[PDB]
Amino acid sequence: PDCHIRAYVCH
Amino acid sequence: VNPTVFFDIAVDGEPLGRVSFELFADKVPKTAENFRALSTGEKGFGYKGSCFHRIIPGFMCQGGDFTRHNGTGGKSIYGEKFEDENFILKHTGPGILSMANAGPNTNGSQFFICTAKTEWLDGKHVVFGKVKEGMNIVEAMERFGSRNGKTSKKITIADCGQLE
Ligand SMILES: *CC(=O)Nc1ccc(NC(=O)C*)cc1
16 A cells, blocks of 8 residues: 555656 | 544454544545444454554555455455545655555455555545544554564554544
8 A cells, every 4th residue: 555655766 | 523443453362552533534535434443343354363464664554355365355344355545645754544456446354554655546436534633553563564464573553442
């Protein structure tokens, strides 16, 4: 459940 | 009154300090109750002994995998997953407690403690609590983090429960 990190990396 | 839970944090088995949290049961009761019961262990499983598997300085500390200890596990007290209860509360700054997920309606046990305002998470992750005391302990945890979250020392919830 790493959606919040994926958002962070792409951002 | 909103419940208060605590984590006693250890670094490679040595006590670091206590973090306590107010859980916003008045606004997200189902999500708050999940975290509360996982903090006491009263269902036979929960956060005690688990590790903070991703610590990203300036962003958040993530934990809650007590079923696989590999960053992919965890489960709620309602079953494997539960629905996003609401998005009333926003990621307003350091200390916010919010649910990790893999998409809509996939809440389990994994959570993160924000160390900054993260408004770009609003509407995607359910906010359900905040650090009450021990933000200095959360900052101490940040010092062990890295770019993508792997930790330089083992950061554990050595004990956890619910305060009076
Ligand atoms: C659930 C999930 O995987 N979320 C997510 C958010 C952002 C991104 N990447 C970008 O926005 C560029 C991927 C996945």
